[PDB]
Design an enzyme around this catalytic site. Structure first.
Site, PDB file in Angstrom:
ATOM      1  N   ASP A 398      49.543  44.100  37.860  1.00 46.13           N
ATOM      2  CA  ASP A 398      49.344  42.825  38.534  1.00 46.13           C
ATOM      3  C   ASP A 398      50.530  42.515  39.435  1.00 46.13           C
ATOM      4  O   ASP A 398      51.678  42.526  38.985  1.00 46.13           O
ATOM      5  CB  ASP A 398      49.148  41.705  37.511  1.00 46.13           C
ATOM      6  CG  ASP A 398      48.974  40.344  38.158  1.00 46.13           C
ATOM      7  OD1 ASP A 398      47.962  40.139  38.861  1.00 46.13           O
ATOM      8  OD2 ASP A 398      49.849  39.475  37.957  1.00 46.13           O
ATOM      9  N   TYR A 399      50.249  42.242  40.703  1.00 47.79           N
ATOM     10  CA  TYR A 399      51.290  41.771  41.604  1.00 47.79           C
ATOM     11  C   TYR A 399      51.790  40.410  41.141  1.00 47.79           C
ATOM     12  O   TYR A 399      50.996  39.515  40.838  1.00 47.79           O
ATOM     13  CB  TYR A 399      50.761  41.682  43.031  1.00 47.79           C
ATOM     14  CG  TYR A 399      51.224  42.800  43.934  1.00 47.79           C
ATOM     15  CD1 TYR A 399      52.575  43.065  44.102  1.00 47.79           C
ATOM     16  CD2 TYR A 399      50.312  43.580  44.628  1.00 47.79           C
ATOM     17  CE1 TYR A 399      53.001  44.083  44.930  1.00 47.79           C
ATOM     18  CE2 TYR A 399      50.729  44.596  45.460  1.00 47.79           C
ATOM     19  CZ  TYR A 399      52.074  44.845  45.605  1.00 47.79           C
ATOM     20  OH  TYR A 399      52.495  45.860  46.431  1.00 47.79           O
ATOM     21  N   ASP A 591      44.210  41.485  43.664  1.00 45.21           N
ATOM     22  CA  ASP A 591      45.665  41.464  43.611  1.00 45.21           C
ATOM     23  C   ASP A 591      46.242  42.506  42.668  1.00 45.21           C
ATOM     24  O   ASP A 591      47.463  42.541  42.501  1.00 45.21           O
ATOM     25  CB  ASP A 591      46.157  40.069  43.203  1.00 45.21           C
ATOM     26  CG  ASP A 591      47.203  39.529  44.147  1.00 45.21           C
ATOM     27  OD1 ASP A 591      47.725  40.317  44.960  1.00 45.21           O
ATOM     28  OD2 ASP A 591      47.505  38.320  44.079  1.00 45.21           O
TER      29      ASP A 591
HETATM   30  C1  LIG Z   1      43.864  30.602  41.230  1.00 47.65           C
HETATM   31  C2  LIG Z   1      43.885  30.871  42.683  1.00 47.65           C
HETATM   32  C3  LIG Z   1      44.176  32.087  43.226  1.00 47.65           C
HETATM   33  N1  LIG Z   1      44.171  32.236  44.608  1.00 47.65           N
HETATM   34  C4  LIG Z   1      44.471  33.529  45.277  1.00 47.65           C
HETATM   35  C5  LIG Z   1      45.885  33.600  45.842  1.00 47.65           C
HETATM   36  C6  LIG Z   1      46.050  35.111  45.869  1.00 47.65           C
HETATM   37  O1  LIG Z   1      45.217  35.614  46.876  1.00 47.65           O
HETATM   38  C7  LIG Z   1      45.368  35.514  44.552  1.00 47.65           C
HETATM   39  C8  LIG Z   1      46.342  35.441  43.347  1.00 47.65           C
HETATM   40  O2  LIG Z   1      45.941  36.326  42.405  1.00 47.65           O
HETATM   41  P1  LIG Z   1      46.716  36.131  40.738  1.00 47.65           P
HETATM   42  O3  LIG Z   1      46.831  37.590  40.466  1.00 47.65           O
HETATM   43  O4  LIG Z   1      45.607  35.364  40.076  1.00 47.65           O
HETATM   44  O5  LIG Z   1      47.891  35.297  41.325  1.00 47.65           O
HETATM   45  P2  LIG Z   1      49.546  35.672  41.334  1.00 47.65           P
HETATM   46  O6  LIG Z   1      49.708  37.086  41.826  1.00 47.65           O
HETATM   47  O7  LIG Z   1      49.816  34.547  42.303  1.00 47.65           O
HETATM   48  O8  LIG Z   1      49.985  35.465  39.867  1.00 47.65           O
HETATM   49  P3  LIG Z   1      49.873  35.650  38.068  1.00 47.65           P
HETATM   50  O9  LIG Z   1      50.889  36.736  37.786  1.00 47.65           O
HETATM   51  O10 LIG Z   1      50.293  34.276  37.590  1.00 47.65           O
HETATM   52  O11 LIG Z   1      48.444  35.987  37.694  1.00 47.65           O
HETATM   53  O12 LIG Z   1      44.332  34.551  44.350  1.00 47.65           O
HETATM   54  C9  LIG Z   1      43.866  31.164  45.461  1.00 47.65           C
HETATM   55  O13 LIG Z   1      43.843  31.235  46.696  1.00 47.65           O
HETATM   56  N2  LIG Z   1      43.568  29.922  44.884  1.00 47.65           N
HETATM   57  C10 LIG Z   1      43.561  29.712  43.487  1.00 47.65           C
HETATM   58  O14 LIG Z   1      43.286  28.582  43.106  1.00 47.65           O
HETATM   59 MG   LIG Z   2      46.222  39.062  39.192  1.00 47.22          MG
END
Ligand SMILES: Cc1cn([C@H]2C[C@H](O)[C@@H](COP(=O)(O)OP(=O)(O)OP(=O)(O)O)O2)c(=O)[nH]c1=O
Ligand SMILES: [Mg+2]
Length: 641
Positions: A398-399, A591
């Site tokens: 996960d990024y 992501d």
């Molecule tokens: C929850 C959410 C994610 N996104 C998008 C932003 C990015 O493109 C992607 C983020 O994917 P995640 O993998 O869900 O986000 P993260 O990489 O920011 O962090 P974590 O380690 O906490 O999981 O989803 C939104 O645009 N709006 C939202 O409400």
């Molecule tokens: Mg993710």
DNA sequence: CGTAGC
DNA sequence: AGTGCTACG
């Protein structure tokens, strides 16, 4: 006119065709499929569609000359074995053979060539549908007819009386029109080769061929490998979850029936509105159709009365049990080669932002770990059902806030860069600021809500919507928006600059050069203008994120191709040492990447990912990647060794 | 159009 | 019809 050459008719013709093919650097092979017409005589049966049989290939390397290749059992001198050997020989790269293969619908063509024909390509690919998508990412899915009309009109009359060219699949794949498989494949191959020459000229004009050949087409290759692999799906850990949620459903139904005093149908919105707003005198919202029973109003009414909370919980769980449980259970392929059930989604890359989605079903749209307890929490989730093959562990990568890091890269915010370079976890910080609690005291759902809020301001959110979601007043939401905007002035500078660029050039530029066209910014409607501005901002940022993850995919595939000299994918395994070993890529979540790594290469392959995802693109901000491993996707644990 | 993921 | 990419129902 059309010039079809039956290569398998004469031995000398076959030999000179083989020599010319080996001396050629750009060909346009395709496939031909017909009906059974009643196996092992007409051709190799196609997996899935048992009523369809492969017949031949169609190769065109210029002009209107289609060299049809026959894999039929019938020239008796040219048997099937040596013909197959020759075809495999000319369809493999070696000794710096820089050959470009133009195939329409490359994923499906690769799959059918691997599973049924037993031959796997290893040259560069030049899918014309992908190039057509690159030209207009927001356009409709390009059928053969559409690309022929828009990129090759002069040869377009070759499709006269051809109703099969309008289908999603290629002309030589569908089992439709009366035209023979050989002729259909030949004309389709000529059309796709000429259209791809036109598309290559257009891409060279647009300066987009580098991003089409270095990352995009290798990403299509990686997605073909993902489609071949599938996702390891186990019904042992899915049927139990389904039964648990069904028990919760009937318990909630009985509880609501005894609370309201009568039995009512939950599915009907009018009955729910009558029972809740009228009978129970719940405060209605401002805005058949007598009352609105949306999720937000139910969430607001959860505190006032227990019944709306139970209704909302039943609605989720039934959404999980119908929109997710049924699609997964309906289509699962039990293959003895891997010894366990799997699910093969269809990877669609024609999204408007460069993202990769999955159709039939949508795997990414699987409910996460949500906990509900009945007469402590069970943490019910269907992500646990994705058990890999025996002697293997799911290895997700996960990024760590890729979107925020990329936005800081193109915004040059000193504060954002300095808060991302450290392990600050800005989402936890904003959650702690919102709830006035310790950052370690935050929960998973609270952190997710905080990240949704933060991305909402990041992409541009109205005060009213932020107020409804945050549970605060409209003025308080507006002041929160203003404080967030003032704290990061570089984000505002980047947003204004990219909005101006979209208004001026008429499109936006991804950081790898791909473009998305948004005429709607010129629309007179203020709604359309604001929507197109926010669309432009999210398009550039999200396209950058998707291209970064695609570069990571292709780099990881290259690295586990050079290393771990074994069968590349389960599709290659079934194309026909014995222990399963590799870095197969099975899922993308917009992501992150899921890799069904074997139990022996868990660490090394992980390290490879932690390299390639880290150094995918040298940005202004280091791209942190958390590599997690687990016996299942549901309960994967962090791995930092 | 409502809701699930990201 | 005012966070956006989707997918499904
Ligand atoms: C929850 C959410 C994610 N996104 C998008 C932003 C990015 O493109 C992607 C983020 O994917 P995640 O993998 O869900 O986000 P993260 O990489 O920011 O962090 P974590 O380690 O906490 O999981 O989803 C939104 O645009 N709006 C939202 O409400
Ligand atoms: Mg993710």
């Amino acid at each position: 006119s059309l010039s079809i050459i039956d290569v398998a008719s004469d031995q000398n013709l076959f030999q000179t065709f083989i020599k010319e093919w080996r001396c050629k650097k750009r060909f346009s092979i395709s496939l031909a499929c017909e009906k059974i017409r009643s196996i092992r005589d007409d051709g190799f049966p196609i997996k899935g569609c048992d009523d369809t049989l492969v017949v031949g290939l169609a190769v065109c390397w210029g002009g209107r000359d289609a060299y049809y290749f026959s894999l039929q059992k019938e020239d008796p001198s040219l048997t099937l074995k040596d013909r197959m050997w020759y075809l495999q020989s000319c369809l493999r790269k070696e000794s710096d053979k820089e050959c470009s293969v133009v195939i329409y619908d490359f994923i499906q063509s690769y799959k059918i060539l691997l599973l049924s024909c037993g031959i796997s390509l290893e040259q560069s690919y030049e899918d014309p549908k992908v190039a057509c998508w690159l030209l207009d990412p927001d356009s409709q899915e390009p059928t053969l007819h559409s690309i022929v009309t828009s990129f090759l009109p002069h040869e377009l009359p070759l499709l006269e009386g051809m109703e099969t060219s309008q289908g999603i699949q290629s002309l030589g794949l569908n089992a439709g029109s009366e035209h023979s498989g050989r002729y259909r494949a030949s004309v389709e191959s000529i059309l796709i080769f000429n259209s791809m020459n036109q598309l290559n000229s257009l891409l060279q004009k647009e300066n987009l061929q580098d991003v089409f050949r270095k990352v995009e087409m290798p990403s299509q290759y990686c997605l073909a490998l993902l489609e071949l692999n599938g996702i390891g799906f186990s019904t042992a850990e899915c049927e139990s979850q389904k039964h648990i949620m069904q028990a919760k459903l009937d318990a909630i139904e009985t509880q609501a029936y005894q609370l309201a005093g009568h039995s009512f149908s939950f599915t009907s919105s009018d009955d729910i509105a009558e029972v809740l707003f009228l009978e129970l005198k719940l405060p209605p919202n401002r805005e058949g159709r007598q009352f609105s029973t949306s999720k937000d109003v139910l969430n607001k009414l959860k505190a006032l009365h227990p019944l709306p909370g139970l209704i909302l919980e039943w609605r989720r769980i039934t959404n999980a049990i119908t929109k997710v449980v049924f699609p997964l259970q309906r289509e699962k392929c039990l293959n003895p080669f891997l010894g366990m059930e799997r699910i093969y989604p269809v990877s669609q890359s024609h999204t408007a932002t460069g993202r990769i989605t999955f159709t039939e079903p949508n795997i990414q749209n699987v409910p996460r770990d949500f906990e509900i307890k009945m007469p402590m929490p069970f943490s019910i989730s269907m992500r646990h059902a994705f058990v890999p093959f025996p002697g293997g562990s799911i290895l997700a990568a996960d990024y760590s806030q890729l979107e925020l890091r990329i936005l800081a890269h193109l915004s040059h915010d000193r504060r954002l860069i300095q808060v991302l370079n450290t392990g600050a976890d800005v989402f936890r910080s904003i959650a702690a600021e919102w709830k006035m609690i310790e950052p370690e005291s935050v929960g998973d759902d609270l952190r997710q809500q905080a990240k949704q809020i933060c991305y909402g301001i990041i992409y541009g959110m109205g005060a009213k919507s932020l107020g409804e979601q945050m549970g605060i007043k409209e003025n308080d939401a507006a002041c929160y928006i203003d404080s967030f905007k003032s704290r990061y002035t570089g984000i505002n500078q980047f947003m204004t600059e990219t909005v101006k660029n979209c208004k001026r050039d008429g499109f936006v530029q991804t950081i790898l050069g791909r473009r998305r066209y948004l005429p709607g910014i010129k629309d007179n409607n203020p709604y359309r203008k604001a929507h197109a501005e926010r669309q432009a901002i999210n398009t550039i940022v999200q396209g950058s994120a998707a291209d970064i993850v695609k570069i990571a995919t292709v780099n990881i595939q290259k690295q586990l191709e050079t290393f771990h000299s074994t069968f590349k994918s389960h599709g290659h395994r079934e194309g026909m040492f014995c222990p399963i070993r590799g870095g197969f890529f099975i899922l993308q979540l917009h992501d992150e990447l899921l890799y069904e790594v074997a139990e022996e290469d868990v660490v090394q392959v992980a390290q490879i990912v932690k390299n390639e995802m880290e150094s995918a693109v040298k940005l202004s901000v280091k791209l942190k990647v958390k590599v997690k491993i687990g016996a299942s996707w549901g309960e994967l644990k962090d791995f930092d060794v």
